[model samples]
Target: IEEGKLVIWINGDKGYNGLAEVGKKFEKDTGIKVTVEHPDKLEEKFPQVAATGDGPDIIFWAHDRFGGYAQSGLLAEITPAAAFQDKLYPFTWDAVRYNGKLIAYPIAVEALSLIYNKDLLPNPPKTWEEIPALDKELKAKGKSALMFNLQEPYFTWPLIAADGGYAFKYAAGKYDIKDVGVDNAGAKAGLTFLVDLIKNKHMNADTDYSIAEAAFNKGETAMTINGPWAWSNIDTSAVNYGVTVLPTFKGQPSKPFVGVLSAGINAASPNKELAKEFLENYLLTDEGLEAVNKDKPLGAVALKSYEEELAKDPRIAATMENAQKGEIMPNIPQMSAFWYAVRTAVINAASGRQTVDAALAAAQTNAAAKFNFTERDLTRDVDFNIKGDDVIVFLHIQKTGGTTFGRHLVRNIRLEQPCDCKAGQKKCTCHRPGKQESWLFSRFSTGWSCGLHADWTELTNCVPVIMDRNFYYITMLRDPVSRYLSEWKHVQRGATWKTSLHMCDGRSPTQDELPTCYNGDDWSGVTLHDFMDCPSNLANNRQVRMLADLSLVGCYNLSTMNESERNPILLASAKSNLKNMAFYGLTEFQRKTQYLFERTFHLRFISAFTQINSTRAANVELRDDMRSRIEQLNMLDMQLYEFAKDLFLQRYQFVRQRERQEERLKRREE
Candidate 1:
């Protein structure tokens, strides 16, 4: 940055040499001296130096390069006057938009075009199939056939982009940032087309920009796939050259990325408005646009009238027409991966280092990373969600609708990469995206590892050993009366929790420490009087027993401490643990439970919870005295339920209050 001048950093090519001439006029009119300097590796240098508040005020480059810069706050948003905005090529503005904000001025445009020799082959082939015979004939004459630079993605894009290959998909005026299309089925087909040409000897296995340019200039090659910028260097005397549209690729529109050469002001620049004024009022005028082509013609003039007049030149019209056939290049930072992968993928396949399929597969494999996305990520899974390293450990409490909740974890929750559940399999791989590490620890995802119907003490000791990331605990609860009644009915219908480990303090409870309620395997059709009479029935205070950290109660060695002393201690322990959980739900209220869970973990469920209010237990006709006796039997759970209902309402109400505040704040913001 200069004291009294606007310093512009640019690269060679694109008629930038004429920028000094254009800037001389800017200095006269605006009294702001414009100094244009050609720098080496402008792409890598600008970001590094400008971020330190040490780079020039203006940067001239392709539009695609500015997305990362704009996102990093290195580029200032630019909007020219209304009349000036109406003068540039219409589609030229698309590449300069990042997240719906205009960040640069489109100056020139280029897209891939087919350049061919006129004398040797005046009639260029319309299809790839027509090229092999020409190459074979040329081989006999010691002249090569068609060749495109396979070392980079830009030159090969029109070939591989045939039959619907894209670097990324565009949608709703923004990019589908997560949707990398270079490895999709359509992309595979296009690579197959390019690979066939290589095997047929019509193209080289390792041609770069230099080799392609050298071969075409020496009249050693009949054709090359490139943009019109090559005209400045092509030797017209050695080979009569003409630019034409690319060959038909599988009879579909073969498109190139709409690469716009543009300029943007640095966000750190103090003279932003003055920089913008120079770009709009001076550099974008008809004379300034023409001066950029004064030294050597650019691909296409970006100015509307200038571009229309340049179309009279046959080769210039070819480049201009090709730009019209393509969509704007995506300016997202994820493109850094695409640029990195596409070069390696193309070179690997072409050099036989990897097969075409292997290379494409590797591109997707190597490109995987934690997502840095644009507009649509609010609904998509990101690192802050379950796809990250954190594990959502679910404690499946008995007869509390944990089964339905477990199924949702494996199958119903929305994710960038959904859990893999194979047909007829009881479990699913709830792994993180692009990783084999599972994010869920539950029955359906991890298969009851702690123990069947494991309690808080068992899971707390077991989960950290299972996964090595941050752990969040979740569970379900139900109204105790209904919960107790359901278990009695479940056991009466021949269900028994006999296999449960009741693992605590490193071992299952001793026979004398914890006696069984039933004498036999199946307590089928047990009388209600007998079931209630058993002092050791787990159905009594089942919620309290599971949630309490039994180490506090001496791990079911009841005689080791006073049973009367353990009552309040166990109730207090259960309340404390339940209150500290990352998430928990009650069966009686479905929607509040869903809302609280999502708000707690920032996750979404595909379907709403449907309450099964009329339970199977309601069918049994209990004596009114027996019902009152059942309440007395599990009086501890009654107290726990009362506390739970109270705490649950407060948490639910708190989440909705926060939700309303968020909605209100967003309404007043950008």
Candidate 2:
């Protein structure tokens, strides 16, 4: 610091004006003439003035554009001096730090966050996926969910950051400027997500604060993006504007930029002594800090005296929460290249100009070239010796209630990325830096492998233990008559018929329905019966496979043979399932079914099956014939249930006998 007489240069706007008001108070308290200069165009005007070696004692500039000044060596480094280190937020300090030296004083930090109209979109999306889905839904309703500045580099940082992508490694007080993780797979995914969202009309562009905020308050647009400045000025009469940090990608949270505003000393000031005295005694004092924070949208670095007053302002507290979650923006000198490369990679990926892998590679290469990245990560999968009831499952036919079952099991345990041998994953590219072939692999415990409907090979061993672990299977059977009706319904929509059944054409259930994105490019038909029969579809559908894989014990249809087939399929399904698998759940006699499972497993499967139908009679009074059918089906189902119960009792006894034998053997061995 040119310590004696500080000549502070700042923007002549409110920020500077606010400081002047505080400076007047400071001069009265201690007679130090603190000169404040705010020029119209600093970037265009300051360099020429500074070249004459008569620059202001301290210059105020933003991190976005300060790279050039620091690179040119015109900015003086203030960080190395121990005095300034203790006073500033670490992020702010780092932002102004160049080549390990602090040159600029940080004044304010701003990062993009969701600015939404609470009246319109009271519940902002909680995840990245929610945004795209919401966009599609809103577009159908002729409404937009959000808005953003796509063409601008600064605004999109939060999206990328939320997806576990950082411009550089900012952890541990070091900036890995050389490692541009932008365009990394995660970053690319994040960008692509945003593009898809915007293209789907989920978000809007070309709306500035005045127009966007006004539209939002008027309930025209649901949401926008901005920093904390909007808090106090927001129109809250007809609208409610509550601020919370944006939700993250894949269950992470959006972390915003936390910056600081400081009164810094200039290096070449003739009155260096006066500048130091002024900065130390007046600028850094409690009064000076309070004066700085009196601005409408005060940032995170506030004085303790102002804390109580700030607590009363809910808006400030919300903004401060957002600021705290994010790191202070980088101040390192080499950050220029780092920022540019990352910005390019992220934008390119987000705009769909380049593949995520390509963009990330380009960014990494560019960053590596501009800065030194000497550290190499040598970690890879080391604990490969995996054992358990490892079962490799294959997919069978599609759409047979398989996914629902599979998901129930898989969600509880660890899953691995599928091996490279499988093809067609959007996230995978062998040529990329990390060539992960499959999207994800579901790993099971102890002799369990998940696949589509099992083939004959899977059932060959037939040991109860093996069946319980390897093929605790599940399948659904529809009554042939109702099944045919379901098939006819499936086909009227254009689904193809095969395997004594047909899948609908996948055109709308009616011709007037608009085309859906899921079926736009790749449309295929599936037969419910064939899907149940085929293991492939079962495995491909996460829900089916998940449920089947995770069931505590095996379950299957009771009768593979001809039966009183047409009348009550739910009962037939329940019965046949009981016979094939070790355990069965009857959806027909839903009340008594829980008891059977409780007796079998000694654990209640359905803990919360509260009756929700207070007015079941209101929906429909069953016809005499329908009542007779339900009674008959329920009786036959109860008969099947009783028979199955007896056998289940025997099975449990056998299991207990085996357990006793095993226990005895275990003790005898030693």
Candidate 3:
């Protein structure tokens, strides 16, 4: 198993850390010197360096980009070896089989998916072309119909694939550029499906001007065509997002582009054979394949691994099926010229600059001129800087307030520990939102948890002691006046907010009806003030009752705090022992309390940033003075409303970082 010294060259300076991990592991197991190099600008420098016959022993690159290089003879020719031929899958080996030479060692693979917001859509359509009726249903629910990067070709390939048209045709072990049939009869029908969506306002140009992913994330669109990289980046807590295979159109599967990344042996390299051996032993080994899957599971190219885990994950299975119809990304010298043409064509059709057929023609012609699939070069010094951890925790604070920053602090602590939760679940329990009535994780589990229900003691007790250390105690405090007023309005308007019935509207608790259970004096008409005071009357006593319910059995002391003393005590409980408590206020710099909170937490949580509550209130058609009076009614209420506006930012920063804590629990078990 001993291999000689090898060097590899990489194009991108990011997202390749999996290679480094395998390199280290391989070096430890075998006596080999692995040299990894990442040029500052490989895209611009690689062709020039290879032309001078000074490239590394092996290189990692996309097969689509090989079109020009293959035509121009810039890449080293890789022939099918007897041992390697039996191990590779048909699709994984597709890109390497150019003419008679199999030029690269396939390492990773990827495909697109039709992703939808599962919360909004309990049952997503099975096919990509079935969006019209789906969009109508979604629009009826006040959600966006559909979305995607119209300028990105692979995203729309489903339509083409379903129409029985493909970007290229393969025959006799050679890819012949025979058709750009997006405008063909079947392809046009597919495009027509999209056209109808836009005409009906069910779809819109994913016009971020920079990135189309924004609309999908903001919940503006119910569905979109995207890739698995989204698994790592999407905020899953906002909605139950799901990914699956695209639907077929007229019995044809929606074929999207399947890109493969592999290691190429550099013919000009001093250690070409050594570089090939390293790639063979590490990238091709079972352990090496698993290492890649751990970091970027969706990027694995090995066929056996794909079959083993595909069914375990529906998303991956759908993606793998989609990959069946996929064409290898063209990699040739002049392939770079195709980027603009493809964009121009898709953009034109989407923007109404040209018909689908015209756009396809324009794109293909331009691609032909610039695509050079002639050269094969050897470069072994490849540097991939990608790295990842076990799992990611997203606090998913519904509204801003200070929850976002608070989440960051939570993540900071968990970074050092394994997160706790059921294995294979995307979200870890540590740094997760706690429920008031039920434990999301098993009782006495160590992990992060927070929420309005988290203010209770039962939840605290259910949390394992080890988890408390990983806890970053934090929450947003609203002005009680505003919060209470909002709750009051919600109750009056038939909205729901959890509150003791006596304190909210003098409603009697169903459990306290018996004479032996409690006295009926002031039992029903308990005002907020009465509950705060803790008098003998029914209204006043309810707050104490709530405190009793909230307190941990061991921590409870009936005499420690009366009704008047309860608010501060509960607030103190919220801060907990983890020490980093963040408090957000509605007012800006003018308020001294706001200033103090901002300084203490090292992050600002103010009214402008939080809007969920205010936005709801603003839609009420109530008078300004009424809103202000409500704001003045209780301090805690106001704080909650103000923080709701920018909940996304706060949750993203503070709450999402709790994954590490859950990881710690997992490690202890392992």
Candidate 4:
């Protein structure tokens, strides 16, 4: 009841901890006495106790439950500070906003994604259409193509939602409870798809979350629809797995429901002002958020700085990507009724007890009755419409001036990412581009230039080919002899960016000995000549190998491909891919590359930064023997490079002509 006192309630029932540490610091800094509690079933208990004017000053719980408490006037309506809003993701704001007021502060987010066994399925299914073929293949191997919690409606909602099903439609700035969309045509389509899967013996109705998780961990299933919450339970050492966004349905995206875990101010608390101050000024600070995550690593913190740290983990990054494409889980009281109705419908349809239409109709009737609202017409065209517009997949080949170009794309073109370099500071080393930042923007930024760092074949296995149709593929090439020489020198000097020896051979070096692993005096020194003559793939036709098919590149081979058959297939695939590119450039021609690139993408060049990882051997001359060996080893790459140089020059000339043509046309119109 005083200025320096506070009360907080957190969900200790849900494995919550690390708040004592937070409270310890809060009291020490501000001389405030803070009390933290963990009451069982607070979701049910808070509303009752708070109605009698007794509740903690601040509460930590899921955003979905905030709506009910807010409606009951048990939660405070907070207008968060601009600084607070700046720290969180845009989607988090939408998730916590209720009745045109910010009701909670988002801490983390969770969304469902496709997790697959990498060993069993080298490439994930791209769309629902591929599931049938996958089913046949998996059956031949005595395994299942897909397994997921069939009984839980939360896991199955994406299937229906992607097609057009919704629990409630938002209109006029609020959820239109009367506009129940559960039994719509999209829902019918989605439910029918699930029924067909079960009827065809591809899946079972009895599968629950536990069964699905166990099957995936045991490698009985190739893939499963799961979220990050299930990750900790799996014995990761026993399985080699990968994660990706859910497969598309008929060219439309299947978006999972994104839920936010947030902190809310209790309306009934006496210390409202102090609670707000603690949450906005202190708890949401960099240090405060750090302590929260340290106690329990939230799936994906909404704070920009914190998220950058969380994204270093690939699993978190993949889930965050899914969350970006997903629909916000509606935090409304009607959601309770909708959840119950939809679960019954899915069960009935999956079990073959009722047809898809009948199941959906029953759900609509039950939901409408529970909410006491009239159900609207159930048949209509509905689509997720989540397809990205103007996607660019930049295949960043190493030591090809890519780091510099990537900065230009992010800073000048997309403008979604921040480049700290100032105007006229093109070569400043003060702000170096980070790999994590590139990954974050590439995967999550919308309508901007997004890219992944992987070779062509690896990229295909990681990203669905369906996405390729929606993306512009671009890459840069380098002269094979010079590139090989640069790579060799970089490895010799213990550069962090060079390809690892373990990648070429199967020998992983330890952390302390990593620098020496590639080259050192104590160890048998692997000289530049030794490196070139050896079977290291990086010393061979790397550029051609990256651009060509995995088979042509000998992806499975222990060493570099020496067969005579490599040249024709590798060169053909590489040259054809280069010509078909949206834009291809040469590192040797930086100015020309930039001009053509900007013209092709209709993006103007802005401020530039210094080139990252400049080669150490700036003036070192390659011996004739070294040059001869590089040329012989990288014959395919050399051919590809020459072809690309000609292509880049032609493209530059065309781009310049186009620029002049447009300028003249504009002048004439004036």
Candidate 5:
């Protein structure tokens, strides 16, 4: 057989470098060839690939997906050697067993714990009762006491469990799908507690996993509830961090879900005997377990002896302590239906949008409707043609409160791809920097518009020019002077602005490094007076140029044109375009703008508010001379702003009248 060969598919959680080292060691020892593939969406792809008999012989992944795979006959039964069986913790041994049979070999153990910055909280709180006191202490230093990814059911589950909430009852040594407990008294109490956190200003409803992790890592928060996977990402030198078990909730110990990472032989593998040999003789060895940790430290290995070597680390000891009080994650096919429902419940409750009892009941009902949750067409009730090839383009003018509205549109209204990062990673798709552009192009190509900026030239360049009727252009404008000032302030500090072309000399003044890539002059030392006088496109009628036709805007080269040559035609073209827009809004009247935007798009925002970039400098009073100079320089913009204000008022009145009419009709019916 010319030695042997084995192909293994591993999950993203396993560090690529460490696993590659393990593969090399296996081949060198046994003269067996090994090919390791790390696929991002292994769980989603495994079953389909396995069914076609065209996948890896072995798989290393989380135990959560094992239930569905084993039930579908995609995994081969494994009988561990007595020595191997004795090495792992008892709970880990049971974790790899699905449908009352051993289907995988346990490799690593993980559970949630409280991770605190030692400098901020030298002595972390021991219980939930102490959190308020700690919160007060942190507030004095402008930091939060505790924060976690409230949008994730994994992080939220421990508190829910501590309050006596359960997903399903495990009776007679098996999980009963019918024993759903999301709407139980415990769930209601737990969710109510979360709601109180938001109301009391302890947490923000908008803080998801990405925000929470970033806040903790950035030293903005004193403590965060996270897991071992997050240990690598922490700036250990900057933050003297410590790990401890989660605080008790109302006297009940916080019990997180314990998860196991395991290796399973594929049912469709050709070399079953060789696969078993690889698992038993190579992976289960002390050297192999050591290599796994070297690739990426994943708390402690399931092997007791291997853990003995790592037990000296206080971090591992804290993790082990947390695991002891953990609830074994249910390895049943029905577990798939629980994550979404519970996550939705947490989001609604934490945002203070729904009563705790109502949120839990909705989650239970939604979970029960798994595989049969009828898709609702939000546009079905509308009389418009939302069917055909139509695109709603949001002209995202920077520093105009665009990010907040765009996020609301994508996460709350549109059905887009979930972020590629794991639940624990800081790079949540929704929270990432480039996500706005990525989702815009992704959904646009598929005939849906996710609020992304598109110039008229780019819009027209599509294979088929967006017909006037097929496209709806929307935008939000700001006061010319205020908008310019905001842009100036944003360039000084905002991450996006610092890296933007609008920076006077191609680099921000705040950037310590010299400008290497710039179009105009070094913007670093340019004063507000010089910035206005410079022949920069941003210094002139930026809004008019963006809104006008290509012929007038001239490929964004309005700098060559004098005010006399640019203002007249450009202003007329911009106002004409504004008149044709489906909806145009002003940042000054954002709420009214949002109302008009929602009605026009047939969408409702989940949570929308202003979070514009700010500057340290105190408010610059617009003196009469400066105000007159700005008005003179931005004559076209001032005209456009006034036109937009009038249009917004008319639209607002129409909306209010329609609402009043509807209310009268409802009253008559009653």
Candidate 6:
């Protein structure tokens, strides 16, 4: 491989020094310049730079961000050299994959372990109940007992797990996104344990990550919950720190969220291939692992060969061994919502702003929504395909709010990685929320893989052959007039669906069946008269035609029936198919549309859906008679839009009522 330099962005001094050490060796041996940056917010800047195609060739971070970077679709895919791949812990390999291909090279793994001051309590307690007594004894001697970041979920998830609650349930080799147990019975119990500790003065509420670490280092606290990143900071001479697995809680194991750190190549980098060659043959070598592990001591090196050699200390053995017993951290994008929801719930409970039940209830509602789970998740045994499942198939009808909804799917859902469309790229790589498999069959994910601007029949007929998963069909519809006028304005500016295939019955509409409205390459610069005068124009009844199963009405062979016959048949079929959708929205009602889609899908918009458009319609001059003509010509869309408003609100109030009634019942019981 021809190599020059590999620029890397990473956080933390140990990680920077560790990689930099190996970078020196790599530079010396391969004539490749290596610049490793220890930036303050690598997480924040990595994506921005990658989107602009000017980011580092290599980046270092935990596997949890894998889905985020992967969704941005800028992560250069890789195949680790067989020699190095075989040397790593197999668990780390699972962390680096997206769509079954290795997207990064996993290096080190770590998780929380019980850290105690040997001078204070040489023997770690077996049961968590002993903590209060220790707190009392230590305070008598002018010190406190156990401490941790009370507001952080990564530190608190063990408590949730110990009490039998979980962030997400694992089944069929993947997480059930809807099965959020964060606020369930076990979570309540686990959180209560922390509450009691705070209220009873056995623990301090302000003991966050830094405060807890500070107290323990100063020998003011006997114990704290932390991982390898905390190892170098301990004042060993003063505190006599020792590492051990977390103590038992409620007679069950306290499990930490274990994650792997990886070095991934930027997909857009011209030197991505060269970057991978260095990562595989140079950076991931045993010596490379040895160097990175030296300065900071990356708690658990993934290489079994190195792990066995490094387990000389009981502390190293404890942290590494404890990581093995922990739960694998979810690397999917849905985890983004949980981080917010869980931390808030913990803060609410710890701060006494809300009861555990109330806090977690809010957590469950908010997090589950972002995870794309509906109210049906409460009692359902629903699980997604471990191979990749629960695909959201967006059936986009042009000029409706489908573009916003589609953008939301890729941008707002907060995937493990976001859909990465470079500054000049026309398309983005919308990988499954976590995995590499494309979970969506939308214009963005599959990239018009079916047909450009596909309607019901085209999507309905084309998707099953391509995607074999639990499909969720959804769409956004606009009022016939607004959609009609907006589309007219677009067409007036030279936009036309000329290349669109009116696919039905596996064949495009024959030239004799669907005729062209204009002779030029485009119908651009056309007046409203020109646009509306073409009676054979496909724009009329566009929404109805798009929603309906056109094959039933003979699919563009309009001679199959009279106007009266075809009009009613298409209208009824459109309404029936609209009703059958997994979810639908009306563009006129942005808030309701947002609400309905979020409610239907079990995810909330990270930001509120905007109502005020740029008022593009403000300048368009349409005479009263012209408006009437537009409506009269597209009467089928008008009727269909009317039906949708009634139907959309019908389902909307049902969800609202169901939620209110259930909540009211709970209030009554209380």
Q: Which candidate is the best by TM-score?
A: 6
Q: What TM-score, to 2 decimals, does candidate 4 have?
A: 0.50
All-Cα superposition RMSD per candidate: 23.4, 28.8, 28.6, 30.2, 21.9, 21.0
How should the candidates be ordered by lDDT, best one leading?
1, 6, 4, 5, 3, 2
Clashing pairs in 1: none
**Which candidate should be chosen as best, given lDDT against the real structure?**
1
Ranking by TM-score: 6, 1, 5, 4, 3, 2
Q: Kindly indicate the candidate among 1 and 4 with the higher lDDT.
A: 1
Question: Any runs in candidate 5 off by more than 4 Å, and if so which?
Answer: 1-5, 30-33, 235-238, 368-670
Kindly list the per-residue Cα lDDT of model 5 for residues 1-670, writing each as its tens digit.
Answer: 1126788888665665676777788788777788888887787677756644467888887787788778767788997778768878887878888867998888888888899998787988888767777787789989999888887799888888887888888899677787788888877776777778778888888887789988999998999998777776775436779999889888888888888888888777877788887777777677877787766677877878878888898888898888888787887766767877888888988888887888888888766643211112111122223343444556666655665555554554433343344544423343223334232222213222222344333443441333223556667787787777666555444222323322112222232222332345335544566555554435456677567764553444445577577678788888777767667778777678777777766666656644343432227665433554565556688888876676667667767787799999999999
Each model's lDDT: 0.79, 0.47, 0.50, 0.69, 0.69, 0.78
Q: What is the RMSD of candidate 1?
A: 23.4
lDDT (tens digit, per residue) of candidate 1 on 1-670:
6556799988765556778888888888768888888788888778766754578999988888888788767787887777888888667887788888889999888788888988778888888667888899889998977877888788777767777778766788666765667787777887887888888777878788888888888888989888766787775445788898878777865688878888989877888988888888777777877787766566776788777777788887788667777667778877777778888898888776788888987776555432222222112122345555788889988888888889977887878888899999999998888888888899998898878888999999988986657777888888777788888888889988788999999999988988888777778998776787788888989899899999998988887689678989899999878877777888889888887777777778889878776787767776443454576677788778877786777677666876799999999895
lDDT of 6 by residue, 268-340 (tens): 6777766777777666667877777665668777778777887797877887667766787888766767878
TM-score of each: 0.55, 0.46, 0.48, 0.50, 0.53, 0.59
* lDDT (Cα) of model 5: 0.69
For candidate 6, report its TM-score.
0.59
Evaluate model 4: give its lDDT.
Answer: 0.69
After superposition, the stretches of candidate 2 with alpha carbons farther than 4 Å from their true spots are: 1-14, 26-51, 61-112, 133-143, 170-173, 204-219, 235-239, 271-274, 277-292, 302-313, 342-670
Across residues 100-143, which tens digit of lDDT does each residue of candidate 2 receive? Answer: 66665554555446667666677887776777667666667666
Instruction: Candidate 5: give the clashing pairs.
Output: 18-295, 505-521, 505-523
Model 6 scores worst on lDDT over the 10 consecutive residues at 377-386
